[PDB]
Amino acid sequence: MISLIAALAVDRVIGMENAMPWNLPADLAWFKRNTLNKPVIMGRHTWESIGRPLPGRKNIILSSQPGTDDRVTWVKSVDEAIAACGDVPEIMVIGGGRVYEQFLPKAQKLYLTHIDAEVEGDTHFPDYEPDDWESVFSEFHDADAQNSHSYCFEILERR
Numbered sequence: 612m613i614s615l616i617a618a619l620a621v622d623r624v625i626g627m628e629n630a631m632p633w634n635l636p637a638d639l640a641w642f643k644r645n646t647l648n649k650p651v652i653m654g655r656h657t658w659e660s661i662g663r664p665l666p667g668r669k670n671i672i673l674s675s676q677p678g679t680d681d682r683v684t685w686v687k688s689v690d691e692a693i694a695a696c697g698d699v700p701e702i703m704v705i706g707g708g709r710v711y712e713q714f715l716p717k718a719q720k721l722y723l724t725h726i727d728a729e730v731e732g733d734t735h736f737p738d739y740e741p742d743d744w745e746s747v748f749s750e751f752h753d754a755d756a757q758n759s760h761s762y763c764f765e766i767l768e769r770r
């Protein structure tokens with residue numbers, strides 16, 4: 612099973628200048644809980660944005676060019692990325708925009724955080740047909756001293 616996980620600001624913005632400009636510790640904690648002990652697939656730009664391997668996860672990087680770091684696994688196609696995960700129950704696709712576009716048609720589950728923040732961005736999450744997806748979990752949180760915007764955690768499953 613393939614799942615996508617992402618945090619979306621207003622208008623589905625997910626990044627600007629190869630960065631995420633907000634800081635929401637509760638959402639990073641959610642990301643870690645839902646990805647720990649699973650393989651994660653990311654594109655090369657997202658790998659450069661994160662800047663280090665994510666511990667406790669098999670890190671698989673998509674790039675057309677040879678890898679430059681043997682602490683992670685480098686693959687050259689979507690099918691190779693999937694195969695490099697082995698026989699696991701759930702593969703997590705962690706972006707960015709181009710990668711989410713390619714894996715969305717193959718995904719059974721979306722873990723989305725909707726952030727109440729207006730962000731100038733240059734990268735968006737793919738337009739997804741709402742009729743295809745059932746909301747199975749949602750949890751709203753007001754802003755607090757640690758998290759400066761309100762946010763909604765949602766899990767959607769393909770109908």
Ligand SMILES: NC(=O)c1ccc[n+]([C@@H]2O[C@H](COP(=O)([O-])OP(=O)(O)OC[C@H]3O[C@@H](n4cnc5c(N)ncnc54)[C@H](OP(=O)(O)O)[C@@H]3O)[C@@H](O)[C@H]2O)c1
Binds near residue numbers: 617626660675686
């Ligand atoms: N808010 C969130 O949840 C979230 C999550 C992840 C990322 N982001 C943001 O998203 C942005 C990065 O997204 P992005 O769309 O620019 O880049 P991306 O999807 O991270 O990376 C694209 C790169 O991945 C490689 N790639 C993708 N598909 C491939 C394929 N089928 N075969 C081989 N290589 C493939 C290519 O690398 P080569 O050029 O080396 O071939 C391509 O240039 C940043 O702003 C980041 O902060 C946000």
Ligand SMILES: Nc1nc(=O)c2nc(CNc3ccc(C(=O)N[C@@H](CCC(=O)O)C(=O)O)cc3)cnc2[nH]1
Binds near residue numbers: 640657706724
């Ligand atoms: N919901 C969600 N939020 C994100 O921030 C996110 N980020 C990415 C890609 N970028 C990043 C950037 C940093 C870290 C990171 O530092 N993660 C630590 C945080 C642990 C914690 O704060 O408790 C990790 O071990 O996962 C992960 C992904 C992909 N999907 C996401 N999905």
Ligand SMILES: [Mn+2]
Binds near residue numbers: 688690
């Ligand atoms: Mn092929």
Ligand SMILES: [Mn+2]
Binds near residue numbers: 697698
């Ligand atoms: Mn197999």
Ligand SMILES: [Mn+2]
Binds near residue numbers: 727
């Ligand atoms: Mn806000």
